[PDB]
Design an enzyme around this catalytic site. Structure first.
Site, PDB file in Angstrom:
ATOM      1  N   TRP A 183       0.804  -1.212   0.000  1.00 49.57           N
ATOM      2  CA  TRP A 183       0.000   0.000   0.000  1.00 49.57           C
ATOM      3  C   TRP A 183       0.841   1.268   0.000  1.00 49.57           C
ATOM      4  O   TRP A 183       0.325   2.340  -0.305  1.00 49.57           O
ATOM      5  CB  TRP A 183      -0.944   0.044   1.212  1.00 49.57           C
ATOM      6  CG  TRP A 183      -0.289  -0.198   2.549  1.00 49.57           C
ATOM      7  CD1 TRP A 183      -0.272  -1.371   3.246  1.00 49.57           C
ATOM      8  CD2 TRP A 183       0.434   0.753   3.348  1.00 49.57           C
ATOM      9  NE1 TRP A 183       0.410  -1.215   4.428  1.00 49.57           N
ATOM     10  CE2 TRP A 183       0.856   0.079   4.516  1.00 49.57           C
ATOM     11  CE3 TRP A 183       0.766   2.107   3.192  1.00 49.57           C
ATOM     12  CZ2 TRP A 183       1.591   0.710   5.522  1.00 49.57           C
ATOM     13  CZ3 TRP A 183       1.501   2.737   4.195  1.00 49.57           C
ATOM     14  CH2 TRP A 183       1.904   2.035   5.346  1.00 49.57           C
ATOM     15  N   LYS A 207      -3.044  -8.774  -6.724  1.00 47.92           N
ATOM     16  CA  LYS A 207      -3.859  -8.450  -5.562  1.00 47.92           C
ATOM     17  C   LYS A 207      -3.319  -7.168  -4.951  1.00 47.92           C
ATOM     18  O   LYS A 207      -2.233  -7.155  -4.373  1.00 47.92           O
ATOM     19  CB  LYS A 207      -3.807  -9.554  -4.504  1.00 47.92           C
ATOM     20  CG  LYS A 207      -4.653  -9.211  -3.280  1.00 47.92           C
ATOM     21  CD  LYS A 207      -4.245  -9.990  -2.045  1.00 47.92           C
ATOM     22  CE  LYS A 207      -4.938  -9.429  -0.810  1.00 47.92           C
ATOM     23  NZ  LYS A 207      -4.583  -7.997  -0.584  1.00 47.92           N
ATOM     24  N   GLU A 210      -5.225  -3.732   0.465  1.00 48.18           N
ATOM     25  CA  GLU A 210      -6.555  -3.234   0.811  1.00 48.18           C
ATOM     26  C   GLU A 210      -6.676  -1.715   0.891  1.00 48.18           C
ATOM     27  O   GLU A 210      -7.675  -1.149   0.450  1.00 48.18           O
ATOM     28  CB  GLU A 210      -7.019  -3.813   2.149  1.00 48.18           C
ATOM     29  CG  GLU A 210      -7.054  -5.324   2.226  1.00 48.18           C
ATOM     30  CD  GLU A 210      -7.716  -5.812   3.503  1.00 48.18           C
ATOM     31  OE1 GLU A 210      -7.399  -6.934   3.949  1.00 48.18           O
ATOM     32  OE2 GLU A 210      -8.562  -5.071   4.051  1.00 48.18           O
ATOM     33  N   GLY A 240      -8.431  -9.530   3.739  1.00 50.43           N
ATOM     34  CA  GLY A 240      -7.819 -10.636   4.447  1.00 50.43           C
ATOM     35  C   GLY A 240      -6.900 -11.467   3.573  1.00 50.43           C
ATOM     36  O   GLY A 240      -6.580 -11.084   2.447  1.00 50.43           O
ATOM     37  N   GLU A 288      10.293  -9.014  -1.200  1.00 51.02           N
ATOM     38  CA  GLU A 288      10.984  -7.820  -0.713  1.00 51.02           C
ATOM     39  C   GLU A 288      10.243  -7.628   0.607  1.00 51.02           C
ATOM     40  O   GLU A 288       9.038  -7.371   0.615  1.00 51.02           O
ATOM     41  CB  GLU A 288      10.767  -6.644  -1.664  1.00 51.02           C
ATOM     42  CG  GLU A 288      11.704  -5.469  -1.442  1.00 51.02           C
ATOM     43  CD  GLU A 288      11.134  -4.407  -0.522  1.00 51.02           C
ATOM     44  OE1 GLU A 288      10.958  -4.678   0.685  1.00 51.02           O
ATOM     45  OE2 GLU A 288      10.848  -3.298  -1.027  1.00 51.02           O
ATOM     46  N   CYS A 322      10.177   1.009   3.126  1.00 56.42           N
ATOM     47  CA  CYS A 322      11.100  -0.047   3.499  1.00 56.42           C
ATOM     48  C   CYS A 322      12.528   0.484   3.492  1.00 56.42           C
ATOM     49  O   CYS A 322      13.425  -0.126   4.069  1.00 56.42           O
ATOM     50  CB  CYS A 322      10.965  -1.222   2.533  1.00 56.42           C
ATOM     51  SG  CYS A 322       9.321  -1.971   2.590  1.00 56.42           S
ATOM     52  N   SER A 323      12.704   1.644   2.861  1.00 60.23           N
ATOM     53  CA  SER A 323      13.990   2.322   2.722  1.00 60.23           C
ATOM     54  C   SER A 323      14.200   3.458   3.719  1.00 60.23           C
ATOM     55  O   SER A 323      15.271   4.063   3.748  1.00 60.23           O
ATOM     56  CB  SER A 323      14.081   2.923   1.326  1.00 60.23           C
ATOM     57  OG  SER A 323      12.979   3.804   1.131  1.00 60.23           O
ATOM     58  N   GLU A 417      11.014  -3.236  12.445  1.00 59.14           N
ATOM     59  CA  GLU A 417      10.500  -2.243  11.508  1.00 59.14           C
ATOM     60  C   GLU A 417       9.179  -1.657  11.988  1.00 59.14           C
ATOM     61  O   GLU A 417       8.149  -2.334  12.003  1.00 59.14           O
ATOM     62  CB  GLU A 417      10.319  -2.875  10.130  1.00 59.14           C
ATOM     63  CG  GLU A 417      10.029  -1.867   9.034  1.00 59.14           C
ATOM     64  CD  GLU A 417       9.856  -2.514   7.677  1.00 59.14           C
ATOM     65  OE1 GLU A 417      10.426  -1.989   6.700  1.00 59.14           O
ATOM     66  OE2 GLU A 417       9.145  -3.538   7.585  1.00 59.14           O
TER      67      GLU A 417
HETATM   68  N1  LIG Z   1      12.249   2.044  -3.727  1.00 58.97           N
HETATM   69  C1  LIG Z   1      11.751   2.884  -2.600  1.00 58.97           C
HETATM   70  C2  LIG Z   1      11.288   1.999  -1.439  1.00 58.97           C
HETATM   71  C3  LIG Z   1      10.117   1.091  -1.785  1.00 58.97           C
HETATM   72  C4  LIG Z   1       9.516   0.420  -0.566  1.00 58.97           C
HETATM   73  O1  LIG Z   1       9.309   1.118   0.449  1.00 58.97           O
HETATM   74  O2  LIG Z   1       9.240  -0.799  -0.627  1.00 58.97           O
HETATM   75  C5  LIG Z   1      12.842   3.826  -2.113  1.00 58.97           C
HETATM   76  O3  LIG Z   1      14.014   3.595  -2.478  1.00 58.97           O
HETATM   77  O4  LIG Z   1      12.511   4.777  -1.370  1.00 58.97           O
END
Ligand SMILES: N[C@@H](CCC(=O)O)C(=O)O
Ligand SMILES: N[C@@H](CCC(=O)O)C(=O)O
Ligand SMILES: N[C@@H](CCC(=O)O)C(=O)O
Lengths: 516, 516, 516
Positions: A183, A207, A210, A240, A288, A322-323, A417
């Site tokens: 998301w 998919k 949500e 879900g 990832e 994620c970064s 995280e």
């Molecule tokens: N590619 C994004 C991160 C993508 C993610 O948060 O999964 C970045 O370098 O900021």
């Protein structure tokens, strides 16, 4: 090549009057359409269902931004049958034809940039530039993979010749697979994970997350207008784990492309390793799964530059990346100077409704809000709260930029995280210790170092064990083509997005010899 | 390049007196060496154990070719510790240095060719040419991977540039992994699976197949003499699943390279998908798991050429190859002509002690003999036995070339891998039906077509779903570099050995950006 | 590559208000710092001395623009020891690391462009555009050599392979050398001569020209901030030949890179040819020693275009360039038309304080003024003075644009490098005679031809013997990368700056063979 060399789509900064006017117009059109309903997309047509899903505005959760159909196992099965039927002919399309289809999709998406950005603003709470970067990246994935796919065209394998024989090796797509998208980059990653496999001949059932089903549907409107043959791409929003579990464990699903939490990623990878009843292949699963990214700053750094990069990296899109920099590792000499600058900059950040283009919008949902606040409580028992740490006023999920200092390297907030605007500051003795602390987490996605000392930078190039490392700049915003994106350890399987290598993951090789 | 272009090592035919003289002396010396004891090889030194393993001569089971130490969990743990310690520095060797080490090993193996071939003759029952092809392929893997590894040297990734920044992407090895090798190509595949990962910086713990521990030890004598640093390669012969299971499920094993039965491969892939307690990465598992390979012959083929290729493909090394032709699919017009020719050729094949250089030696063990004979009994109630089907006189595990005809496509002998000298002949109406039957098995490793009709060959190139397809020639003997080897479906993960792509499997990518 | 393709740094024209404002601000900051003292830079640190050197403003010689330390033999020896100590490890840096260091230096220099330009204006009397071109060229050298150096990375030599052997040839740097830089391009050439050798692994001791010690120190501030390891680059301003002679004749100096007068260059080349007591190598000496450059104009030329180019080439930076047009060779048909146009344009040129951005600033020093005026007196006895020829009012060393006509080809002013704003016009019969006269000097650096006749241009391409030839444009301002710069005959050793070939001069080759 038959098209111009790849170039990244510019990210709109909205510094001009025309840009701001265009955005306001887009925001108005999008909200005027909040009452729209988006069906599933299966076998080249929009298919509605009895039950529906409601998408809310995280900046005003009592406001519905749209509704979509809700897929169940029956629809997932129908999508899989359509995907396999399509694969039979889509795999035989000349690569040049498939690549042209992608280029058309990119052109269509580019013409609808403002609309998609405005949808991101209202549906997932991205401010203006975060929204523009997201859509620009999606366009980049399409443009990049369209070109990269041609590098694998028939017959692409370099082999050693043999007397009196023709020896030809070439790549072929795998089949029909499932894409489980996040998301936080519901246009960019949603698009990339789908078009990469599709570009080289695979078919996909996607998919959406949500919280981002509406913008995912708009991306499918683009795929539909582009003209992908029926069954090549399918859209299955759902609630879900029902749809995802059904497809991931299905004996007829060939591959799984996933981006999301480690918890889910671990389950997907484990399931992919099992042979379901009647299954006739070894499933490929690409995942990832996040990170606990740190920026190291030593005493030789430009402290103002470092503070700016840290704030951008830690709080961009409310730290929901994620970064995102969730750890700030400072050597003794850099501790006070950098921390004071980070606090001064962070305390000036605005938080509010995303459409007003604040520095921070709201976190994405009530559940995310609950999680982030919970980690803040945990942090109060591990480190020292020196900034923010609380919910702001309003029904929107507004959380203030938060900073914890004197955090032990092995504290939960220094290891897990949080995916929120929470930065943990760790004090270390020297650069060697900074690297040790940086590496001591289960993850290995992004990392950064601010320093003028060449020896420290090159040392980090060799030993700061993360898939995407940046020196003297922000650690977020990896650009397609420029910075192959993907990590090490529990950050995933190292499927480098926006790189030539990504497409190889969705191909298998055949070697054919003819003795004359 | 700093060396001559890759060329395959010639396979000795022993037609010259010089070749025969050399082979006879090598066979004599190996035989006179029967009973020798070989220890484990851990951390650069030979380590013995209290318990031992016995390796028997399948041509004369009462004869002990040699004995080896027997590794247990303790030795596996010691090897893993040594492999990780070695990895820390081995990963930093310039690629040119690692490649030169491989080239030295190849030169040393080449100088011991006859000895290694003779050891294969006695330990696993290969006739002279099968043994020579095995050792030649091992040399090829070393020579090929040494060169291929240089194609991945720092910094090998093609990326898009960005203003005011240096963006550098490069590959790095994964770490320490385990190699579980087969007994049918105990020099070739044993060597390839080890040196591929090692060439690019990984370290390996290798478990040889129980029936081929002596020749595996001799390969390690070569590795030791070549000078691989302590811990880079480790040799752990063992009995049962103990060692393999311990390493495959270990939280500190980074990757698993396996070649063997589907039953074991399925368990390995499933285990690799699980996160062992304390594990900090997603394990990579590469598996090659056999096949049920068919050769199709239509009415336009050169029937004599086809019959010869079928006999070589079906009975070479007693059919104990994952590439062996175990199915012969004949269109109506080719049925009688080809079957009569195949029977006439097969009934002339000699069977006896491998040292006598017969067309067929014995199967590898008592257990293998029991399994093959069991499948023959099953086949008697599924198809029509028209040749062989019984054990021959003698202590050795000698089984006669066997042929069943009018076999139903779904019969157990037409679906399950027997791994013995048993050919199942299936009669079909036309080429379309031939391809349907060919594709209808859980496997997809090798396949062949004998036909003069261009349209049939090109049709098969596109639709005969196997990883290694051959037209108008045998379907066994894939050459390193010429024919990337690996299959589809339950034949494995398509890790193409003897190809540039193979090494990519043992590397991960890092992207480093510096903003100036 | 990991950076954008090389592009030349744009030369600021100051046509915008912002550009002029930025320059005025820079000029103010620089003059506010006229009282600054700059020490020597040895072994990574600024080292001061008892005695000092004073730098004067040639536009107002009673005004001091800064002072620096003064190196003697003791400091030169200390610098040499530091350079050799550094070489031991700097030579082993991966080329990618060394190139990144250069790129950082370029980025730092680019951020200080206005400051450096303003320093050139006040210290050596360059007008605004001459100053901007100088700094832009320095940036170009860094950017270009950083990239060019990668073309020589390990192992770069193309060799013929041999059976059973690895044959690898590669380049390695020479060691520690001395750079003797000029005062006319004290940022550009000073920088290029240093960073070229350093980029590929050498270490350098640099002696700036006395008249430009302040700007040289500022360049070293950039090297220091960039982070070059201690000893890699050293700064030794000094008075007289003491330091230069000591290093050039030193048994432990590996190479000499010099740009300056022919008189000094001849002495350096002779000394480099001698084996000093205890010396263990043959010294390499690269020298660029000036020219007596001519522009030929024939009757087919665009006379207005020619006059403009001649004036720019002859009087840019007061003719103090080794590339300056000091001879104008006109065929009979072009004589009157071109001379009248040149005189009309030249008489409109302004001369005054460099900071006011006049067409001509002052010559660099009292000594240079004495030399130029002396040549003007000599010229009065050889040719006809038709324009200028005298000192203008003011303490600054202002000399008017000067033109002598009817000058004999072998006259002293038609043969010797005046290095001032003095143009000698020679009348010839035809193009053939024009080429004969053009070639008849001891030099061969730059030359130009204005003509529309293709045959004359291509004739000159083959026979106008100069290292840098230009058609229908100015003969000064060679751009890095575009126009490799260096001459023939007594103009030097043809070390082409701004070209791939330049770096080869600072490398030696090793060939290593391993018989397996
Ligand atoms: N590619 C994004 C991160 C993508 C993610 O948060 O999964 C970045 O370098 O900021
Ligand atoms: N590469 C061998 C087969 C190896 C195996 O049996 O696993 C061949 O083509 O005959
Ligand atoms: N490269 C400069 C000349 C440098 C010098 O005068 O030595 C030019 O082409 O104008």
């Amino acid at each position: 090549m038959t098209v111009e060399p790849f170039r990244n789509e510019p990210i709109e900064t909205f510094q001009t009057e025309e840009a701001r006017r265009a955005m306001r117009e887009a925001l108005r059109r999008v909200r005027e359409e909040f009452g729209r309903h988006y069906p599933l997309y299966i076998g080249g047509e929009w298919v509605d269902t009895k039950e529906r899903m409601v998408s809310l505005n995280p900046s005003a959760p009592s406001e519905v931004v749209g509704t979509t159909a809700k897929a169940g196992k029956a629809e997932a099965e129908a999508a899989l049958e359509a995907a396999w039927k399509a694969f039979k002919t889509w795999k035989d399309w000349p690569q040049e034809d498939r690549s042209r289809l992608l280029l058309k999709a990119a052109a269509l998406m580019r013409r609808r940039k403002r609309e998609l950005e405005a949808t991101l603003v209202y549906e997932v709470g991205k401010n203006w530039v975060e929204a523009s970067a997201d859509v620009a990246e999606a366009i980049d994935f399409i443009e990049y993979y369209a070109r990269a796919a041609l590098r694998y065209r028939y017959p692409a394998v370099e082999v050693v010749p043999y007397p009196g024989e023709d020896n030809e090796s070439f790549y072929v797509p795998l089949g029909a697979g499932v894409v489980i998208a996040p998301w936080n980059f519901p246009v960019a990653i949603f698009t990339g994970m789908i078009v990469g496999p599709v570009a080289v001949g695979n078919t996909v059932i996607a998919k959406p997350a949500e919280d981002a089903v509406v913008v995912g549907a708009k991306v499918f409107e683009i795929f539909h207008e582009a003209g992908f043959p029926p069954g090549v791409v399918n859209f299955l929003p759902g609630v879900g784990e029902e749809v995802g579990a059904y497809l991931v464990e299905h004996p007829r699903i060939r591959f799984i492309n996933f981006t999301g939490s480690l918890e889910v990623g671990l389950k997907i990878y484990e399931a992919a390793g099992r042979l379901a009843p009647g299954q006739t292949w070894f499933k490929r699963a690409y995942v990832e799964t996040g990170g606990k990214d740190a920026i190291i700053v030593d005493e030789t750094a430009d402290f103002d530059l470092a503070a700016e990069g840290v704030v951008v990296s830690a709080y961009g899109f409310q730290g929901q990346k994620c970064s995102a920099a969730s750890r700030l590792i400072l050597t003794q000499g850099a501790y006070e100077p950098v921390l004071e600058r980070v606090l001064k900059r962070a305390e000036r950040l605005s938080v509010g409704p995303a459409e007003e283009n604040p520095d921070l919008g709201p976190v994405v949902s009530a559940e995310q809000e609950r999680k982030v606040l919970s980690y803040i409580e945990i942090g109060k028992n591990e480190g020292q709260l020196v900034l923010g740490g609380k919910r702001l006023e309003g029904e929107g999920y507004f959380i203030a930029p938060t900073v914890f200092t004197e955090v032990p390297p092995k504290a939960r907030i220094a290891q897990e995280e949080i995916f929120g605007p929470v930065l943990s500051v760790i004090r270390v003795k020297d650069f060697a210790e900074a690297l040790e602390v940086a590496n001591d987490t289960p993850y290995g996605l992004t990392g950064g170092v601010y320093s003028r000392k060449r020896e420290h930078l090159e040392w980090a190039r060799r030993e700061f064990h993360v898939g995407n490392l940046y020196f003297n700049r922000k650690i977020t915003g990896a650009l397609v083509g420029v910075q192959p994106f993907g990590g090490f350890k529990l950050s995933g399987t190292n499927a480098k997005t926006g790189a030539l290598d990504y497409l190889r993951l969705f191909l298998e090789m055949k070697a054919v010899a003819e003795r004359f």
